[PDB]
Design a protein around this ligand. Structure first.
Ligand SMILES: [Cl-]
Ligand SMILES: [Cl-]
Ligand SMILES: [Co+2]
Ligand SMILES: [Co+2]
Lengths: 227, 202, 227, 202
């Protein structure tokens, strides 16, 4: 989707807010910590999302005005809500009512429950991770060193193909192997893995600029075609 | 709110806070989450992980030529052997800064960052200014961090559009003769492993 | 500039808010009326802006979060402020202080003044308009029917070349004549007129889509090159 | 406001209001503007102009074949002769809807609209949804206006990237036999002159 999230190459967002590392506080509000717990806790159990693909599309679907103002963990809250409702884990009406309760009475008590089995399960997920690497029977269409065409495609659903790289020539830098295909997986349409490549693009090609800059982007096979 | 213009009106951050609590409450009531599962995650990301892990890898590379060689040849095997592996750190690559090549890592589409090796990303890393600009004018972005590279130095920006993650291996600075591996590790900054800074002489 | 204003081809902005014409109120706040008076009144006298080019860049320079939330006449206020300060008509400190006065005391009295000569001058501007058409000594580089290349250029200052049309093939539909060149004029760098063309682009070329859709865009000569 | 995140915080609309008043006050104090100059503009755009002018041009085209021919051959000369000329209406073109060609006008970059002929643009015309979408999925946008064109009808979207303006000339509907030019003019909607609606039979 050609959304507000896809910012690469945009002008006008201003200076980067530099801060020294030691002063770069992770969390300033408890709800931000909670957002992390919600995301990892749900994902570890496959609730609403099993990999990050579905997670990302829920963020991408935010209203632009929300995306730009919610703050970062606001994205995480938005996508957990989106995905839990979308998959039928939570009912939208119930969620909205409960939201209203905490809006009007922020000090409403949170129910307590200990589940050490669930802790172990979550811990296992944090340490084991979840690799999207797969094997497929096909061979790679492209080879290291090949000049390829990064296609002009405009999926309305999820994609990992940034707009700034579309309709451009690039050079294959590496064949990673086959990875779960985001444009399908984010919409629960199957892993349908495809070869993933790293592709180098020159500044002259991306922007028409004259400096010694390049961008290395990872692109799925179906994003590209031979020249 | 004029119903022609609902899109002018953002949710306040109090909404997200309330929404978070509502999700937490409903999921615990339904048996999907527990208090201790949520806390376990918070402990991991706020306290257990951090850039010190990457710093140790950098210092080892500086002090042990054979290790640096193995790391650059097959980073994913080497990093997994060290235990720096996990969620968002399943496939970690390492790219070396050299005198004429400077590496910078970004996730233009979101925030992708190798938590198991580096901990949580910088505030600015996740925000639009860095994300938008670094792929197009990296020299201008780097200058805002105090890094003013000569035109003759090539910049390679690594946009994390897949689950493959990258760490930058920065060069050992002058003035470090005789330092131990542990002492060199204390020199390695988070920013240097993203590519937005060189390491200063001590 | 590749800014938030350049929305053509973006996904995620949602449904169009249809309203019946008779119910589509022009102004709901007096400051919106005032914004119109400020813009036209200043422009008529060449204060801050002489044509619309400088006007547009001031809007394009807004913080994205402001652009999306200010409402439409908010853009107009932002660009009048920008341009009057930029050209030295108003001092930023004085403007900020006076802003603060009206923030804290909204009912502060507005000074009254009648200037019938100025009224006539403004009226003349509203009726006479200001054509950007010029004559130049050069001939057009392109001809009706010619297949051209819409270049991959990325000016950091003002341009009228929407990003969605860059790096594309199109067909010349008309040679309008030479027009004042926005990419220069917006920055007060001279009219430097260039031939303006209307160019037809097909949906297949812009988006890779299969319907009978096309876009006719007006492009200055320097935005294009022969094939 | 956390100084890492000033960009999360929009100016409230009370800011723009105050800013407007501040500009007004300073410019009048300095002799640059007057109360009556500001009012003259407001009167013009809120009251003097409107879509009725375009409606008259459409009705005339429907009732006078020679006029319609001249209009389509040289709209700028013809419209100027009628007095529909002025700021943002110096160069106005007219495109005819036909049975297999449908025209839609947009300013993707801002809001450009022929004030002297049509008055001020619709609320939605200036907003991102219409602007973003109509160049890429015009059929979907049109359906939100109640216009569901067959696949076989070609759509031409006219993006106003220059000061050249376009008005759509919509087709005369069924059921209008015997109507006078003045009566037909009352049928011509603002939306039909932008291309987002056909005209309904009376
Ligand atoms: Cl370095
Ligand atoms: Cl029609
Ligand atoms: Co990311
Ligand atoms: Co416009």
């Amino acid at each position: 989707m050609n959304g507000i999230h896809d910012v690469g190459g945009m002008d006008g967002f201003g200076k980067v807010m530099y801060v020294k590392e030691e002063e770069d506080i992770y969390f300033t509000h408890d709800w931000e910590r909670l957002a992390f717990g919600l995301v990892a806790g749900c994902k570890a159990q496959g609730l609403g999302m099993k990999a990050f693909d579905e997670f990302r599309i829920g963020i991408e679907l935010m209203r632009p005005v929300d995306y730009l103002t919610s703050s970062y963990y606001g994205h995480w809250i938005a996508t957990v809500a989106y995905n839990l409702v979308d998959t039928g884990v939570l009912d939208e009406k119930e969620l909205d009512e409960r939201t209203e309760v905490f809006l009007k009475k922020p000090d409403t008590k949170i129910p307590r429950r200990e589940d050490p089995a669930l802790v172990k399960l979550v811990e296992k997920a944090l340490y084991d991770g979840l690799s999207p690497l797969r094997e497929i029977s096909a061979s790679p269409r492209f080879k290291v060193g090949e000049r390829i065409k990064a296609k002009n495609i405009h999926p309305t659903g999820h994609t990992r193909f940034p707009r700034y790289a579309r309709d451009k020539y690039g050079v294959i830098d590496e064949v990673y192997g086959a990875h779960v295909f985001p444009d399908d997986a984010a919409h629960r349409k199957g892993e349908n893995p495809q070869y993933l490549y790293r592709v180098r693009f020159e500044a002259e090609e991306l922007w028409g600029y004259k400096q010694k800059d390049s961008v290395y982007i990872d692109l799925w096979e179906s994003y590209m075609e031979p020249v | 709110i004029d119903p022609r213009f609902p899109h002018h009106h953002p949710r306040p951050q109090s909404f997200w806070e309330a929404r978070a609590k509502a999700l937490e409450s409903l999921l615990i009531e339904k048996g999907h989450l527990s208090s201790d599962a949520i806390e376990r995650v918070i402990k991991h990301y706020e306290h257990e992980l951090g850039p010190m892990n990457g710093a140790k890898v950098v210092a080892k590379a500086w002090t042990d030529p054979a290790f640096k060689q193995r790391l650059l040849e097959d980073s994913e095997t080497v990093l997994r052997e060290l235990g720096y592996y996990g969620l968002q750190g399943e496939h970690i690559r390492v790219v070396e800064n050299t005198d004429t090549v400077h590496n910078v890592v970004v996730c233009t589409l979101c925030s992708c960052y190798p938590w198991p090796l580096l901990g949580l990303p910088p505030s600015w890393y996740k925000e639009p200014a860095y994300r938008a600009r670094v792929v197009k004018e990296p020299r201008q972005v780097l200058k805002e961090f105090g890094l003013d590279l000569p035109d003759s130095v090539e910049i390679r920006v690594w946009d994390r559009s897949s689950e493959i993650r990258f760490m930058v291996l920065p060069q050992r600075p002058e003035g470090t003769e005789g330092m131990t591996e542990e002492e060199l590790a204390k020199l390695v900054t988070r920013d240097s492993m993203i590519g937005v800074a060189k390491i200063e002489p001590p």
